[PDB]
């Protein structure tokens, strides 16, 4: 019983399936059997998530070893081809745990950004030069150009396909299931937020990006003809603000469904220090972004998942006891509009909040993750508490539970 696509919606055993999800990048890490893992916590997190109506996690499948202090440590890939089999047993365990609970997972295999190593880490290994952490340089245009250089590197593509092959052809070491046979996996996903480059991307670079999405999705389908494939794109914003790049990249049959993300604070629509003043304008831009991507989903006749979206705590606090009124009202507005869209038969096929902190805790004064600290939905490139929902965020969890039930057929 795999998750399938039929037009603008997902089906499971021929019944509509709607994604009522969270991002939990570290869920497979939690499954590791060694000191990196926390299997007791993983079971408790999944129990709590299931109790609040979550059916789907979006999870990082692979990381690349990094020496920067904005990235997960340890890594799955300790230089090209040097995979940590003990950490892969954590993915095996996560898949067993999700199956017990009738939850699914979307697994992404790379990262535009630095927090799992990702595309810039590929390039650093190839060139024998260290990664420039954009949290240190504040040189984001240069970072995005460097990350997109990955698509043009034949060596990087060979290693990336090596990595896709290593996971897709895996046998679950616990239950013996081939990954290609495991219905717990909803989708393979090319990367987290792949973009074509920076704001100065050329027409040739846009075409390289489009061709990369097509060829990578085709390659996965050679290994696995039946799991869904998605890109992990943010949408228009992840397409150098060119909706035609989004359309062209995702028009291939091998992309089964569409993704979009929304980052109203990172995109400068919302100012976390002036929330009352900036929310009205930010909400106008968000509702327009949602309609623009629902309209593209109708044109391509594919489901659309808002698989990553979040908002700061009130006044940008990282503290657990800070209020989340702006986040909660944003989530309400998104869920109201998306539920209306689903009622009207449009390809709105659900969501994954960014992100789930659950029982994870920091005791770092500066909220900055260090190796050995609890993993949170906020990865190591962001303060622990920036975007994640803690178990104690009662107001937010009530909204999630309410709408998770309303979105279920």
Domains of the chain plus CATH, in order, are 1-409 (3.20.20.80)
Beta bridge partners of 386: none
Beta bridge partners of 187: 106, 228
Give the separation between CA 189 and CA 133, rounded to whole angstroms. Answer: 24
Give the separation between CA 281 and CA 275, rounded to whole angstroms. Answer: 10
The full 3-state SS of the chain, as one line of letters, equals CCCEEECCEEEECCEEECEEEEECCCHHHHCCCCCCCCHHHHHHHHHHHHHCCCCEEEEECCCECCCCCCCCCCCCECCCCCECHHHHHHHHHHHHHHHHCCCEEEEECCECCCCCCHHHHHHHHHHCCCCCCHHHHCCHHHHHHHHHHHHHCHHHHHHHHHHHHHHHCCECCCCCCEHHHCCCEEEEECCECCCCCCCCCCHHHHHHHHHHHHHHHHHHHHHCCCCEEECCCCCHHHHCCCHHHHHHHHCCCCCCCEEEEECCCCCCCCCCCCHHHHHHHHHHHHHHHHHHHHHHHHHHCCCEEEEEECCCCHHHCCCCCCCCHHHHHHHHHHHHHHHHHHHCCCCEEEEEECCEEECCCCCCCCCCCCCCCCCCCCCCCCCCCCCCEECCCHHHHHHHHHHHHHHCC
Q: What is the strand order of the sheet 228-230 is part of?
A: 228-230, 185-189, 104-108, 56-60, 19-23, 348-353, 304-309, 258-262
Exposed, middle or buried: residue 113 (CB in 10 Å: 0-12, 13-18, 19+)? buried
Give the separation between CA 208 and CA 148, rounded to whole angstroms. Answer: 9
Give the separation between CA 181 and CA 47, rounded to whole angstroms. Answer: 24
User: Do residues 378 and 71 touch, judged by C-beta distance below 8 A?
Assistant: no
Token duo for residue 17: 């399936």
Give the separation between CA 391 and CA 47, rounded to whole angstroms. Answer: 12
Residues 6+ apart with CB under 8 A from 204: none
Give the separation between CA 2 and CA 177, rounded to whole angstroms. Answer: 14
User: Do residues 18 and 409 touch, judged by C-beta distance below 8 A?
Assistant: yes
Residues 6+ apart with CB under 8 A from 365: none
Q: Classify the phi-psi angles of 59: left when phi > 0, otherwise alpha if psi is within -120 to 50, otherwise beta.
A: beta
> What is the dihedral angle through the alpha carbons of 240, 242, 247, 250, rounded to the nearest 10 degrees?
0
Cα 9 to the center of its chain, rounded Å:
20
Give the separation between CA 324 and CA 316, rounded to whole angstroms. Answer: 9
Token duo for residue 84: 């940590």
Give the separation between CA 45 and CA 49, rounded to whole angstroms. Answer: 6
Residues 6+ apart with CB under 8 A from 265: 271, 272, 311, 312
Bond prior to 74 in cis (omega within 30° of 0): yes
Exposed, middle or buried: residue 74 (CB in 10 Å: 0-12, 13-18, 19+)? middle
Method: X-ray
Token duo for residue 338: 């998306």
Give the separation between CA 135 and CA 365, rounded to whole angstroms. Answer: 18
Number of CB atoms found within 10 A of residue 275's CB: 21
């Amino acid at each position: 019983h795999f998750v399938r696509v039929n037009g603008g919606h997902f089906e499971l055993q021929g019944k509509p399936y709607v994604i009522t999800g969270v991002n939990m990048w570290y869920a497979a890490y939690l499954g590791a059997p060694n000191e990196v893992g926390d299997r007791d916590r993983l079971a408790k997190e999944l129990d709590n998530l299931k109790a609040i109506g979550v059916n789907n996690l979006r999870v990082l499948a692979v990381s690349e070893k990094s020496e920067i202090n904005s990235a997960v440590k340890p890594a799955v890939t300790n230089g090209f081809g040097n995979y940590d089999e003990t950490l892969l047993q954590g993915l095996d365990y996560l898949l067993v745990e999700l199956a017990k609970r009738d939850m699914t997972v979307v697994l992404y295999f790379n990262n535009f950004w630095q927090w799992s190593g990702g595309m810039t880490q590929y390039m650093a290994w190839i060139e024998g030069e260290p990664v420039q952490d954009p949290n240190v340089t504040n040189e984001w245009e240069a970072f995005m150009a460097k990350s997109a250089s990955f698509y043009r590197s034949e060596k990087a593509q060979q290693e990336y396909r090596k990595t896709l092959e290593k996971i897709i052809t895996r046998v679950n070491s616990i239950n013996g299931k081939a990954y290609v046979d495991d219905a717990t996996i909803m989708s393979w996903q090319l990367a987290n937020e792949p973009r074509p480059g920076n704001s100065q991307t050329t027409a040739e670079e846009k075409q390289i990006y489009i061709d990369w999405v097509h060829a990578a999705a085709a390659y996965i389908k050679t290994l696995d003809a039946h799991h869904l494939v998605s890109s992990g794109s943010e949408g228009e914003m992840g397409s150098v603000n060119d909706m035609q790049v989004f359309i062209d990249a995702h028009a291939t049959p091998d992309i089964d469904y569409l993704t979009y993300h929304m980052w109203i604070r990172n995109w400068s629509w919302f100012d976390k220090t002036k929330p009352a003043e900036t929310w009205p304008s930010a909400w106008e831009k968000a509702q327009n972004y949602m309609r623009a991507h629902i309209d593209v989903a109708k044109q391509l006749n594919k489901p659309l998942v808002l698989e990553e979206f979040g908002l700061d705590r009130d006044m940008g606090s990282y503290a657990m006891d800070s209020t989340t009124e702006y986040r909660d009202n944003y989530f309400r507005g998104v869920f109201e509009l998306m539920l209306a869209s689903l009622e009207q038969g449009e390809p709105s096929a659900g969501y994954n909040i960014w992100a789930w902190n659950g029982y994870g805790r920091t005791t770092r004064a500066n909220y900055w993750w260090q190796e050995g600290d609890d993993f949170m939905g906020d990865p190591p490139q962001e303060e622990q508490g920036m975007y994640g929902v803690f178990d104690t965020d009662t107001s937010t969890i009530a909204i999630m539970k309410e709408f998770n039930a309303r979105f279920q057929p």
